[PDB]
Symmetry: D2
Subunit: 115 residues, 4 copies
């Protein structure tokens, strides 16, 4: 589990369930190439995105499809998606958790990088 | 200018208007003494809380009444009020802006501190 | 586990470890009375604060001693503590997690209330 | 006035000054076309990005170069840049303020949208 994503809903105070998440890796020609994807669980978590073998150093983008989440709940959103762009560095610790807290016109994100 | 409060609404994408804000100062007997209060303008801002002379050093609590705000908007909130507790002016006068961003089950607050 | 607290550090991207947390309940004379307390674990979590028996409806305050956390790391903080004040309502779901994300001059908090 | 960006620093309690901001607009071929760019002032604000005439409807991305900011300050950051993607002006012109609050391993962004 080198990479995990956790998504929370600030309107209802709950995990954000069945949210699509796409991860991309920056290629040498500076295009974004698909890397991993999935949908959040009942707990707002998405596990099993990648393996240690596949998750090499580089620049990654995590796109969380927030507009589809809100629209389906009957709530008008502002963003198309939430995006988190970061460099994976082997020097530091080994497990990355990208967390996002969603509101219709705002979001917060953090990374927790542990060993 | 010594103390400003600015409140935004993350559900509607707007200033949070007519929000009640109370400021307290910790007294020597460790109780919270009322200091100043006001309600936010149409821009989500509250100025005129205090003057430099009245705003002495100590421990201040800024209580923003988020629950009344969300109830007026027709939305069920979790928190009773967002609170921000800080020591002010302990190395001389500063200008403080306390900003809050509100959602029904969450808030985010920051401070900008400047030296006149 | 009706009440859990989780604290994260936005400067280092890590759990906030050994942070003191005090919980109070509003008494009938509108004073705050001590209810529970503890220190966050290596994972930034504080479990076992209360039992279902003790955690009745009412107004609660969670005080997280952030100033002591930062000062010990050699980083100058703004707040005395982070405070979260909320009503526990039996109507809604049964487990409350209060999460806080700390920075030296800012913090974010959310509640996740699940069944 | 149609597009403003405002950036704050949660480590120092200050505006984030001289932060580079790039705006892109999604083209018909689904690539991101440069639209406007600037750097934040001493108040953490960036105005003058566009005019009402130039700011047509579509999908915009506001990329705030947080990594250069933290590196200048001497602090190790996680993110490459904070990104905010949104559809603008699809029901006529609006005024958008995009605010971001930065920490080394986290950021929080909101929007205030007003109808002139
Ligand atoms: C806590 C938090 C606060 C803010 C504040 C944004 C903000 C926006 C404005 C413009 O409307 C003005 C101020 N000042 C300095 C009065 C702050 C923005 C975000 C994204 C947050 O999370
Ligand atoms: C206030 C705030 C909270 C959070 C939550 C992070 C968070 C991350 C995790 C995974 O490690 C676990 C929880 N729970 C439910 C215990 C919360 C994330 C951000 C970005 C926020 O701003």
């Amino acid at each position: 589990c080198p990479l995990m994503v956790k998504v929370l809903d600030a309107v209802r105070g709950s995990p954000a369930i069945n949210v699509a998440v796409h991860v991309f890796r920056k290629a040498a020609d500076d295009t974004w190439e698909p890397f991993a994807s999935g949908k959040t669980s009942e707990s707002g978590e998405l596990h099993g995105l990648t393996t240690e073998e596949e998750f090499v150093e580089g620049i990654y983008k995590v796109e969380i499809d927030t507009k589809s989440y809100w629209k389906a709940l009957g709530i008008s959103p502002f963003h198309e998606h939430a995006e988190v762009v970061f460099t994976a560095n082997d020097s530091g610790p080994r497990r990355y958790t990208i967390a996002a807290l969603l509101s219709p016109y705002s979001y917060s994100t953090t990374a927790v990088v542990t060993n």
